[PDB]
RNA sequence: GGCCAGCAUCAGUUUUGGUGGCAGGAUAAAUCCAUAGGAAUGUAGCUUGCCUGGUAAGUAUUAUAGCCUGUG
RNA sequence: AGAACUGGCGAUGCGGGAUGAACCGAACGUAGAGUUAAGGUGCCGGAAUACACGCUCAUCAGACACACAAAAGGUGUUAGUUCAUCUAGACAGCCGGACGGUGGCCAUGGAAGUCGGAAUCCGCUAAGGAGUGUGUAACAACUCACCGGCCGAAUGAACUA
RNA sequence: GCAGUCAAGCGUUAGCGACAUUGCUUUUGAUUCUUCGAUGUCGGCUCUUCCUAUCAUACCGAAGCAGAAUUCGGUAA
RNA sequence: GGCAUGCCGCGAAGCUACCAUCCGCUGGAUUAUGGCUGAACGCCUCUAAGUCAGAAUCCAUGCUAGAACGCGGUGAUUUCUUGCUCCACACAAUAUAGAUGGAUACGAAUAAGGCGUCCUUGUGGCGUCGCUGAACCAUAGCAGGCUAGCAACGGUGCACUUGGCGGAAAGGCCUUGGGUGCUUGCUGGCGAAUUGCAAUGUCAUUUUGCGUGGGGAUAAAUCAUUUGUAUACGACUUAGA
């Protein structure tokens, strides 16, 4: 009979870092343009979407169905550097790293720990080398062109722009899908300090996989028949695959929550706000199902590492309405207008 | 006589080469091995695979984490065979093993350095013609060594560079030989010839 | 006025090389020379079909090579 | 199971046998020199990865208290014995003959040789089975048992290690 | 098993003996209504680990296997 | 308002659920099996040589952890503990799994190759070599002195300087320009003693510290408060010049 879990997931010691490191990246298709392999963000909360589907041969074909969906915060991102790797018998080794020298205070805080007590002796000294006519970054580009057949770009999250006010941002590597590494490095150099749009990397109905750290539960350490004669739960990296993206959330403008059917002008911000989270005011991605971890936990979005031709991925969504009632209790209305209509005027109104 | 000797694994028997390397190491002789992926083992491929699988089963019965690592790299496999020949659990064995180094392919700066072979260990010389033999590279690839393709490109590049260097050396030596022939018939040349040169 | 070594030759144990003269075999035997013969895995030559100038067995037991046998 | 008899341990050190209280050797004070028994001379392991005649492909050979699952069997290998084929053309490979009474006699819708079954003849020759098989309602259709046309020098059968 | 039978081979070379072989081995799918002194602690829960002399799934194979479905040899833990 | 976790209906939240929801991979090598070519044996043949398709089998793709004693890159590294670091030498102690000339670089085949040559550039012809590296350089001066010239103007140590190549651990190699020593390639003027018939007779550096003098830089994390996504206890992630 089965056992108390999967032996491949044991031992289950605590994760070495809150941020889930990417184990692998999708194969580099040279014929495709210079796109982005993955993205990083913080998940806000859960919501319910009611929609119909075009699924011929299914019992619920042409019938409206409600499925669990989640909203992940993903504000605009700016590239901070580029990293190249060379294949070796010991594996892929980092050749050299480059920086634009135009690093925001967020990455400086991330690098340091006691920023308030820190003297703020940032990269300025090294930047002074770059703050010239050049020929240094040109040398780095030449080195990464002659070698480093695989290039990974470095980006940092706009933690300051996140609804949950914070000063320290996360940093992680992201690969490219473009042609020969010449185009990759040229695009990376041109895109230094340039804003990155989430919608440019994903699209509706796209199948994606994500990695995150599950909720911790503290110490979790009876039958006296275990050994023959002849202690932690949660707070570990976990992966999930085959997640359908229903719609790209352009949360910097109204009408994102309402669909073409309901057109109930409002934002996806649940009444009162997300539990233990702020108020979304920037770009976000809508993905069905659920992702490990809790609110404010960093998550990574990847396109499954491979292309899928199954009809499930091909099928397109027909969102009719998105639920945004107050999750802080037994919510009954989507916007204050509905609550006022139901209850009418109140003492506070006069 | 040389302080350091580089042995090419290509076309060499694992057992004899390992035995001679271990014997030389115990006498205070630095030895380094290159192109270990090109090493060969007698017998047919299936027999070698079955023999290797037998060692894989061996491990710590109850604690399946501290058992001897079942290395997949050809260099590590070659080192493991030499380990059993030397007194590993001794100070002398540990000291001798330090002098020994094994790498897949020919990484620098050993690429520029001279390479030699062991006449009493050549597979082509000692193994009878027609006898089945197995290449260590194939076994490594079959046992999860996902690095054969990576080594191939570096080996090809090094071979091209060495071919260019050999062409330059041949061009120089042709002129050297022409000059030596021109210098012949001189009195010093006659004296050298009469004195064994 | 002693202790530790080197050098030359010494007596015992012992190890590894060089060299000369003798006795024994079939008074070693092969090899070498002479003598009369035999054969082919036929030597020169001759002979027949083919064809650039070789080829095959037919003859040829030593001839423009040699072998063996018996004896001295 | 039981008898007389021999050796060792008993009372025992030492070299080797991975190690074995019964194995091989071996006359036990303290040191030096040189030669050996047993085991060997690829490493642990001190000694030739020595010569020479052959075998061994083994999916875990082989280095195994030698004891029995052990008798054969392998279109696996190496070496040998006997009996015949033979230039009155050695075995094997391509082509034809394979007849005539006859479709034998009894069984009977059909057994023309190949669903039943007794002998299997005589005529005839280089040779022909009242049939070896493949397949037919009934022959019919094709092969060899046996022979010849070409080849072209050793071949087939039973045993032993 | 016993007692033979044929006799590949070994034989004091009269005897042995491999494989087959005959007799125990309610002929009308009837009913035996049969289930005969185990002197011993083991028996059953959960989970793990190992074998294949493997039930399903998987692999292919031989069948009066036309399909459905069925009989069986083998690979595979 | 306390009291009898007194209770009642609701009740977030702590726990937690087939008693709720989202997902649960794809390329090769094989077993048995079906074949190819083709012997073995003048036939034949899936096997002896190779090879095709081929199992939930095997390897990786993917997933969890990560050598707590593996690795690469990146930023900084103390202004009055003036403390610290690089480089030229300056004395010491340290110890060398053990210097006592030189790791001298094609690859492929081993029933075949390297070199020069001819063209027709060929899987070509000719000559040349292996049958060991017992090979090539270099090796003369106090562990290598003080000097005179001869002809070459070559060989080479040394700091600058020009460009190129090298990322598998590159940290290495070649080279443009002269400058400064050696030159035993050749011939001469001198010291060798006494270190007593031998007592390795050292002149190789590994690291560390203080000194001179030309430059170089002006940080950290923890303690503590706080926070809670972490949370038995520890650890850990946030915020305050």
CB-based burial label for A302 (10 Å; 0-12, 13-18, 19+): buried
Find out whether A64 and A50 touch, Cβ atoms under 8 Å: yes
DSSP state of B20: H
Residues 6+ apart with CB under 8 A from A22: A38, A172, A173, A211, A300, A302
CB contact under 8 A, B105 and A89: yes
Specify whether A321 is located in the same domain as A202.
Answer: yes
Specify whether A329 is located in the same domain as A189.
Answer: no
Q: CB atoms < 10 A from the CB of B33, how many? A: 25
Find out whether B118 and B16 touch, Cβ atoms under 8 Å: yes
Rounded CA–C1' distance between A230 and E47, in angstroms: 17
Q: How far is CA B54 from CA B51, B61, B119, in A?
A: 5, 15, 31
CB-based burial label for A150 (10 Å; 0-12, 13-18, 19+): middle
Give the best residue of A8, A85, A89 to mutate against chain B (max B CB count within 10 A): A89
Specify whether A66 is located in the same domain as A109.
Answer: no
Task: State which H helix or E strand residue A229 sits in.
Answer: none
Helical H runs in chain B? 14-25, 45-57, 74-85, 91-99, 123-126, 136-142, 148-183, 187-194
Residue A141 sits at φ, ψ, to 5 deg, of -65, -40
- The Cα B49–Cα B44 span in angstroms is 9
- The Cα B9–Cα B36 span in angstroms is 5
Q: How far is CA B92 from CA A277, B25, B29, B52, in A?
A: 65, 10, 13, 28
Reduced to 3 states, what is the DSSP secondary structure of residue A253? coil
CATH 3.90.1180.10: which residues of chain B? 1-147
B29 C-beta less than 7 Å away from strand D: no
Contacts 24+ apart (CB under 8 A), B166-175: none
A232-248 b/e with 16+ CB inside 10 Å = b? Answer: eebbbbbeeeebbbbbb
Radius of gyration from C-alpha coordinates of chain B: 22
Rounded CA–C1' distance between A3 and E71, in angstroms: 39
Q: How far is CA A195 from CA A79, A97, A200, A321, B72, in A?
A: 7, 20, 11, 31, 45
Specify whether A115 is located in the same domain as A64.
Answer: no
Specify whether A65 is located in the same domain as A92.
Answer: no
- The Cα A170–Cα A158 span in angstroms is 9
Evaluate the omega torsion of the peptide bond into residue A274 and state whether it is cis, within 30 degrees of 0: no
Which residues in chain B, range 72-91, keep a C-beta under 7 Å from any nucleic strand D atom? 84-87
Specify whether A34 is located in the same domain as A103.
Answer: no
Q: How far is CA B41 from CA B14, B49, B64, in A?
A: 6, 11, 29
Provide CATH code, domain B148-197.
1.20.5.4280
- The Cα A251–Cα B141 span in angstroms is 51
What was the experiment behind these coordinates? cryo-EM
Whether residue A219 lies inside any domain: the answer is no
Q: How far is CA A314 from CA A178, A193, A241, in A?
A: 24, 35, 16
Give the closest residue to A178 by CA, choosing from A27, A31, A24.
Answer: A31
B39-54 b/e with 16+ CB inside 10 Å = b? Answer: bbbbeeeeebbeebee
CB-based burial label for A35 (10 Å; 0-12, 13-18, 19+): middle
- The Cα A339–Cα A348 span in angstroms is 14
Which residues in chain B, range 123-162, keep a C-beta under 7 Å from any nucleic strand F atom? 124-125, 129, 132, 142-144, 146, 151, 154-155, 157-159, 161-162
B19 C-beta less than 7 Å away from strand D: yes
- The Cα B74–Cα B82 span in angstroms is 13
CB-based burial label for B194 (10 Å; 0-12, 13-18, 19+): exposed
B125 C-beta less than 7 Å away from strand D: no
Specify whether A182 is located in the same domain as A87.
Answer: yes
Give the closest residue to B24 by CA, choosing from B103, B76, B96.
Answer: B96
Specify whether A70 is located in the same domain as A83.
Answer: no
- The Cα A335–Cα A270 span in angstroms is 8
Domain boundary among A167, A196, A225: A196
DSSP letters for A42-66: EEEEEEEEEEEE--TTSTTTTS-EE
Whether residue A54 lies inside any domain: the answer is yes
- The Cα B83–Cα B88 span in angstroms is 6
Whether residue A221 lies inside any domain: the answer is no
Rounded CA–C1' distance between A345 and F73, in angstroms: 65
Q: How far is CA A184 from CA A22, A23, A97, B5, B121, in A?
A: 20, 21, 14, 43, 49
- B1-147, which class in CATH? alpha beta
A209-226 b/e with 16+ CB inside 10 Å = b? Answer: bbbbbbeeeeeeeeeeee
Specify whether A82 is located in the same domain as A166.
Answer: yes
* CA neighbours closer than 13 Å in the CB half-sphere of residue B160: 5
CATH 1.20.5.4280: which residues of chain B? 148-197
Specify whether A39 is located in the same domain as A86.
Answer: no
> Which residue(s) pair with B42 in the sheet?
B133
DSSP state of A28: -
DSSP state of A26: -
Evaluate the omega torsion of the peptide bond into residue A272 and state whether it is cis, within 30 degrees of 0: no
Nearest nucleotide to the CA of B43, by C1', is D57
Q: What is the biggest distance separating any 2 CA atoms in chain B, rounded to whole angstroms?
A: 83
A87 interaction partners in chain B (CB closer than 8 Å) = 150, 153
By residue range, what is the domain housing residue A95?
76-196
Reported resolution, Å: 4.7
Whether residue A226 lies inside any domain: the answer is no
Dihedral angle over CA of A48, A53, A56, A59, nearest 10: 40
CB-based burial label for B57 (10 Å; 0-12, 13-18, 19+): exposed
Q: How far is CA B64 from CA A11, B60, B84, B97, B144, in A?
A: 12, 6, 22, 27, 19
Residues 6+ apart with CB under 8 A from B14: B39, B40, B41, B78, B81, B136
Nearest nucleotide to the CA of B17, by C1', is D42
- The Cα A251–Cα A73 span in angstroms is 9
What CATH number should be reported for the domain holding residue A142? Answer: 3.30.1430.10
Number of domains in chain A: 2
Q: How far is CA A32 from the centre of its chain?
A: 23
Specify whether A279 is located in the same domain as A201.
Answer: yes
Specify whether A339 is located in the same domain as A322.
Answer: yes
- The Cα B34–Cα B102 span in angstroms is 6
Reduced to 3 states, what is the DSSP secondary structure of residue A330? coil
């Amino acid at each position: 009979a089965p056992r108390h879990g999967h032996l491949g997931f044991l031992p289950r010691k605590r994760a070495a870092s809150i941020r889930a490191r990417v184990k692998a990246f999708p194969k580099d298709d040279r014929s495709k343009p210079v796109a982005l392999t993955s993205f990083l963000g913080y998940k806000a909360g859960m919501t319910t979407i009611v929609r119909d589907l075009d699924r011929p041969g299914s019992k619920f074909h042409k019938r409206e169905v409600v499925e669990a969906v989640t909203v992940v915060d993903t504000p605009p991102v700016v590239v901070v550097g580029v990293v190249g790797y060379v294949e070796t018998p010991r594996g892929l080794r980092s050749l050299t790293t480059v920086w634009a020298e135009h690093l925001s205070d967020e990455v400086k805080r991330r690098f340091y720990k006691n920023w308030y007590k820190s003297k703020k002796k940032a990269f300025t000294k090294y930047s002074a080398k770059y703050a010239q006519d050049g020929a240094g970054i040109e040398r780095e580009l030449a080195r990464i062109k002659k070698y480093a057949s695989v290039v990974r770009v470095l980006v940092h999250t706009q933690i300051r722009k996140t609804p949950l006010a914070q000063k320290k941002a996360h940093l992680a590597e992201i690969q490219l899908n473009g042609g020969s590494i010449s185009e990759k490095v040229d695009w990376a150099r041109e895109h230094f300090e340039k804003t990155v749009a989430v919608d440019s990397v994903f699209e509706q109905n796209e199948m994606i996989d994500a990695i995150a750290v599950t909720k911790g539960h503290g110490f979790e350490g009876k039958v006296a028949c275990i050994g023959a004669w002849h202690g932690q739960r949660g707070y570990h990296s976990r992966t999930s695959i085959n997640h359908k993206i229903y719609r790209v959330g352009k949360g910097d403008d109204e009408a994102n929550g309402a669909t073409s059917f309901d057109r109930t002008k409002k934002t996806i911000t649940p009444m009162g706000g997300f539990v233990h989270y702020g108020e979304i005011k920037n770009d976000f991605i809508m993905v069905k199902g659920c992702i490990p971890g809790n609110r404010k936990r960093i998550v990574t979005l990847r396109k499954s590492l491979y292309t899928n031709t199954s009809r499930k991925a091909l099928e397109e969504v027909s969102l009719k309405w998105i639920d945004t009632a107050s999750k802080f209790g037994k919510g009954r209305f989507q916007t204050p207008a509905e609550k006022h209509a139901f209850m009418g005027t109140l003492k506070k109104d006069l | 006589v040389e302080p350091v000797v580089v042995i090419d694994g290509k076309g060499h028997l694992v057992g004899r080469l390992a035995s001679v390397v271990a014997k030389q190491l115990l006498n205070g002789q630095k030895i380094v091995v290159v192109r270990a992926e090109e090493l060969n083992i007698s017998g047919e491929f299936f027999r070698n695979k079955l023999k290797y699988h037998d060692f894989l089963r061996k491990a710590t019965a109850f604690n399946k984490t501290r058992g001897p690592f079942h290395f997949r790299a050809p260099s590590r496999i070659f080192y493991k065979a030499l380990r059993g020949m030397v007194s590993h659990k001794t100070a002398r064995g540990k000291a001798a093993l330090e002098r020994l180094k094994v790498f897949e392919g020919i990484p620098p700066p050993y690429d520029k350095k001279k390479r030699v072979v062991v006449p009493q260990a050549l597979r082509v010389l000692r193994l009878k013609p027609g006898r089945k033999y197995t290449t260590l590279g194939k076994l490594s690839t079959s046992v999860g060594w996902k690095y054969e393709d990576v080594v191939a490109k570096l080996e090809a590049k090094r071979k091209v560079s060495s071919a260019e260097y050999y062409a330059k050396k041949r061009a120089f030596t042709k002129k050297v030989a022409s000059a030596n022939a021109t210098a012949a018939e001189s009195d010093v040349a006659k004296q050298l010839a009469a004195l064994g040169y």
